[PDB]
Amino acid sequence: MIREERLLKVLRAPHVSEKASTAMEKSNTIVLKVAKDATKAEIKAAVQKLFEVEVEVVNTLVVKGKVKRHGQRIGRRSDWKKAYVTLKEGQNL
Amino acid sequence: AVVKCKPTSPGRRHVVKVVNPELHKGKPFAPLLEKNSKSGGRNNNGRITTRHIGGGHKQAYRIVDFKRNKDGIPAVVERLEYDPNRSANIALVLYKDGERRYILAPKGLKAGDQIQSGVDAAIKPGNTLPMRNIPVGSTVHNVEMKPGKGGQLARSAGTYVQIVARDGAYVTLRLRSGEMRKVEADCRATLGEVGNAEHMLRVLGKAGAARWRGVRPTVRGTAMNPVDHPHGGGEGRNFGKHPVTPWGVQTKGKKTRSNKRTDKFIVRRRS
Amino acid sequence: MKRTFQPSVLKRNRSHGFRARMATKNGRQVLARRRAKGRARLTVSK
RNA sequence: AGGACCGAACCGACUAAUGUUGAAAAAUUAGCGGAUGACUUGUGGCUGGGGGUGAAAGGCCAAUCAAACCGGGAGAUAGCU
RNA sequence: GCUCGCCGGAAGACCAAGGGUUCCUGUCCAACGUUAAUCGGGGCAGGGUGAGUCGACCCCUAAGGCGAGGCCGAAAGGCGUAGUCGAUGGGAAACAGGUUAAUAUUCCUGUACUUGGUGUUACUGCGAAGGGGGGACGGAGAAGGCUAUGUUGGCCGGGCGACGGUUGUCCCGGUUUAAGCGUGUAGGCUGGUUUUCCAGGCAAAUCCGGAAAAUCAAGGCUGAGGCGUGAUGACGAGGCACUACGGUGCUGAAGCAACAAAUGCCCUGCUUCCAGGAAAAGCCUCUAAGCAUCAGGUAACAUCAAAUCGUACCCCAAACCGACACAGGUGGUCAGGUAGAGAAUACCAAGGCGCUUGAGAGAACUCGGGUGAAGGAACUAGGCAAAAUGGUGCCGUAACUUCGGGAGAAGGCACGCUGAUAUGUAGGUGAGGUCCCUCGCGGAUGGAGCUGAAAUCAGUCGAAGAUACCAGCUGGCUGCAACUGUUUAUUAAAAACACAGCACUGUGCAAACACGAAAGUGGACGUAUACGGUGUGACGCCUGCCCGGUGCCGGAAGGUUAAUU
């Protein structure tokens, strides 16, 4: 079983966007910025424990950082992980 | 059977082909096959060490019994086959105990024939005996040079070795090249001549036919520049020098054999 | 017209990559040279 | 059946014109040869510089080849400008 | 927005490589864009890539790489065994419909499938680094059966026409449905079953191979498509109604048949040829040491698992390789209509574009084209270039020849349309009815319906009917090279190189020879009907004299002659 520290660290922030709102309203799916090393099982366990809801399935993808510019200084944002987690239509968290 | 093609195209006019109705037409005996991939004439350094090799048709290797060490058990010829690895035909043989092998097909060997190896075998074509038990003047092929090593002499289509003399532990053979050699009397040989003697009569007819066999074109030394052949150079057709190899050794009559170890076994050179 | 540079990431890594350099004494020498010069990128790897 | 025939793709490059500070450090246009074969093509691999490879032109080996490229001996030497 | 023009085997669509945010939205026009710019692949900000089934990762190997020991080598290192890596190849599993500004076989809806684990039950000899089978493989050719797809009819909905006519034999549009499951068909392959024995498969084996009898000879395996189900579902012209004129919601008919037909599928088949056509694992099976009322295995039921990485966008291109938003290059897949042999060509569909300087004028001259009186190569180094020929079917076709050719030699005639033969012929396809039974995706007759060349005769229009695009100029004498090929990437394609054939010569196998201070390797898992070197160059008739010079081969009496002593 996954420990408490791991599950306390794997969730970073709730993502906010129009697609997130559409998914939440339609399929009761919430979108989370998670740890880069977090697997679907850890995400599910952390959402079940720390959020106290019930989970069907986790969808994950990695967002690549954008190569940007700051006054003739090339710079790159980091990669982060995004999780589509489906809550089984009984909580509306 | 030797037949010439009709000249319905320039590449077919001079083609002469060797067709044998008795060769098997199906796939060969698979448990006796190996993969035998091509080298192009390159050694393990990756350098061309033998020129004019490359391409040609993919071939599979057939394990052939050159030793014939299953003495005393009769075997029956099952079928004659085509072997892309050599000029001779090979014959699949079934032993009484259920073991199958490929042998070099001697002249006249046909399906249903009976063969045997050992000291107590009859003097029939296809039968293998130690040369101590073979009468003087016989005609043999697949001749051993060491006992139990396997046949190494007279293995090409139409070739044979005559037993000239015999005294003591050695016999005197007459080789296909015309050379008289001494061989230990306990080396084994197969009675008869190697089959497919009509092999020399084939005419390839065109360049691509030789390319199918994996031989690349030869470029004359006199056609290149002196930087890459001793024959090279000149304004027009010029030679003015004694012929040599690409590496400078005379190539018209100069002898290259130097083996003092085996010189004792040669009664007389091919001359 | 076909030009000389025809990219292939696998061939690039196998010919000039970090592990190919580390495989021989002379490749290790080129790595040491580039470290002494302070190249910000030792090889083609990234 | 065929290194068979005519002819697209595909592979080439015989002629002419244009272009020649080009659209292009070798092309365009109109014609042209081969087009089931010694054919052509993708991917990967091997051969290393007095060495490789070459159906042989001293051809090709990264727009470089009668001895590649980079670094070093090195401020070579220069009765010459 | 309406007109016009261009591509349409692409200038449309989708992958792989490669690139990396170029994708979508808001905003801005300084610089970049060969002009302007409100626009942009430009700047700035925010958003966007969802997988048990697709790919990688993974299991398995090829070429090849590395390589414990090992062999070799002044050092560095080189080769290689057992091993271990290495795809461009083998190996489990998902389809339709809908949805975003941008993702979808990944989200949703519906219906599936695969491999492994955990438990329960029943039965039961399981077991591998070993054996056997399988996986497992070429070129070409031909037929038959299909489907994708298309056309037409039938049906459903709509229409009655800006100018003569248009209730009809008229016009427009639609007529779609997957994987999976069940059936096991056209067709391909092979004789089954049971005993007894055995010098083989390194041991063993009940498995494979072999020998001998009994008996029945129809059993077994593979197999496109069709049909049923999936599916009373979904989709669906069109209508109703809103819209901030993007788009949103609901309703929603018909949803059949015949014919034609692939380069796709049956087919990893069949026939045929010689140049004789990977490997290993997954898989099935056999036992061994062993375990032995335990493990293990077979089968049914339930539960659990299928992680990680990729997924936007370009991809014949303004995003890749070419310094550029560069007339260049870049592997694979899809493949509609009319004409046509055709993926040629012309005009079009779906879809996508008008190529990021324009406006005038209508000089010389340059470029790319059209036509030309009379003459017709008089041009010129040379008919360079241009002009000309050009299809199908039929008649006819010389010297010479290696008997195949030459040959499409040359040359000549017909060709459109309408009607009749014949309200659609020859042919192809094929329903209803009937008959039989191994009863079914069966067979025999039946010919409805559909589709449909070629020709003959008459008639008819034009200057012209292979009317456009497309599409051989032909003949005669002669040099060289036999021929197909190859070559100076970028001024030379040839008479040069190669070539099949010929000859000489070396080479007896630890071969000669070549790469290597060596170990080793190629030659070759070949063995003199083989392999290397050299010259010549299909074929026909032939290949004369000289061994004094130089080379090579053979000899070893005599003269000379090194280290050595």
Ligand SMILES: [Mg+2]
């Ligand atoms: Mg899901």
Ligand SMILES: [Mg+2]
């Ligand atoms: Mg040779």
Ligand SMILES: [Mg+2]
């Ligand atoms: Mg030759």
Ligand SMILES: [Mg+2]
């Ligand atoms: Mg020359």
Ligand SMILES: [Mg+2]
């Ligand atoms: Mg020389």
Ligand SMILES: [Mg+2]
């Ligand atoms: Mg001369």
Ligand SMILES: [Mg+2]
């Ligand atoms: Mg002379």
Ligand SMILES: [Mg+2]
């Ligand atoms: Mg041809």
Ligand SMILES: [Mg+2]
């Ligand atoms: Mg042609």
Ligand SMILES: [Mg+2]
């Ligand atoms: Mg070329």
Ligand SMILES: [Mg+2]
């Ligand atoms: Mg051209």
Ligand SMILES: [Mg+2]
């Ligand atoms: Mg031709």
Ligand SMILES: [Mg+2]
């Ligand atoms: Mg020259």
Ligand SMILES: [Mg+2]
């Ligand atoms: Mg170059």
Ligand SMILES: [Mg+2]
């Ligand atoms: Mg030099």
Ligand SMILES: [Mg+2]
């Ligand atoms: Mg110096």
